[PDB]
Amino acid sequence: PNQALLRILKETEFKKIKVLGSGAFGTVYKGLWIPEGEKVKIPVAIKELRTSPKANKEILDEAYVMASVDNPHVCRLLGICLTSTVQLITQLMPFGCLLDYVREHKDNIGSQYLLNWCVQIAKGMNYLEDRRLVHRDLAARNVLVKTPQHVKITDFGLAKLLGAEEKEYHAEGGKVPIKWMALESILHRIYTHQSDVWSYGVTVWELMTFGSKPYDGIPASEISSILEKGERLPQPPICTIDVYMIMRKCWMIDADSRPKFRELIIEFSKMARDPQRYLVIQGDERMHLPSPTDSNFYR
């Protein structure tokens, strides 16, 4: 019986080394945890959404979601510290965000690494689909890098849980990225796993453009218009027509016609068997050297 459980950790065991980053909707801190008896240090990341009872209940359900998932492709919450505010604590990923990573090492990441990442994101998204929950905020920023060969998913601050007969969800209000939303979500504020398929397509578009901003010149409000026109995001340079077919099928009108995450795993894993066939990269033969090159690496 897989049920959630929250392990409370003492404030005297946390030594917040510094801060990590303030996302456009969140603030995260870097830390190093020391148990009171183990005498071993483990790097951790601390999220403190700062003070209102609406964001307090948001941390509640977010922590509930993050303390119940269990997958090597989904970063899991390990505990909650109790200070003046509520601290969420997960295991720290050394290499950090994937969006800023592919923006930093675009001339060193090969076609093999990009497809395996898409395979891993699809696996984690397929796992949280089997647990009957929608992420509602899947972007390249919310993807981290444990090792350059393994990525994870975080930030469940907008995730929701589906009931028994419930196969969808109705949003309270706005405050959603929109660029990663499906057209049905922009119009009627409805979220499904196929809306997560859309956001998955936008994430893959972010990875294949090495971190380009989708709908850059568009002033957000024009997104629903160009979506109704019939156009989507353009075709990335490295992507053949096959990969752009997968991404376009994640962005079509009917939600039921979008590919489930199961067949996305099968497709990108088949492409991962031959990376040179579907991505054309100038280098490929060269590889990046991670861990000696510090860059983003801290205890």
Residues contributing to the site for ligand 6JS (CB under 6 A): 20-21, 23, 26, 28, 45, 47, 75, 77, 88, 90, 92-93, 96-97, 141-142, 144, 154-155
Report the nearest approach of ligand 6JS to the CB of residue 20 (Å): 5
Does the annotation flag 283 for ligand binding? no
Report the nearest approach of ligand 6JS to the CB of residue 4 (Å): 15
Report the nearest approach of ligand 6JS to the CB of residue 71 (Å): 15
For the record, the structure tokens of 57 come out as: 């209940």
C-beta closer to ligand 6JS: residue 123 or 141: 141
Instruction: Let me know if 107 is a catalytic residue.
Output: no
C-beta closer to ligand 6JS: residue 88 or 208: 88
Does the annotation flag 284 for ligand binding? no
Residue partners of 76: CB distance under 8 A and separation at least 6: 66, 67, 69, 70, 90, 91
Burial 169-199 (b: 16+ CB within 10 A, else e): bebeeeebbbbbbbbbbbeeeebbbbbbbbb
Contact (CB, 8 A) for 191 and 171: yes
C-beta closer to ligand 6JS: residue 66 or 271: 66
Does the annotation flag 21 for ligand binding? yes
Residue 209 carries which side chain, given as an amino acid letter? T
Spatial distance between the Cα atoms of 92 and 44, rounded to a whole number of angstroms: 4
Cα–Cα nearest to 179, from 247, 135, 226: 226
C-beta closer to ligand 6JS: residue 77 or 134: 77
Does the annotation flag 295 for ligand binding? no
Report the nearest approach of ligand 6JS to the CB of residue 155 (Å): 4
Does the annotation flag 201 for ligand binding? no
Q: Identify the helix (H) or strand (E) that includes residue 273.
A: none
Spatial distance between the Cα atoms of 127 and 141, rounded to a whole number of angstroms: 20
Cα–Cα nearest to 245, from 265, 267, 230: 267
Q: Identify the helix (H) or strand (E) that includes residue 287.
A: none
**Which residue of the set 100, 130, 137, 284 is catalytic?**
137
List the catalytic residues.
137
Residue numbers belonging to the annotated binding site: 20-28, 47, 90-91, 155
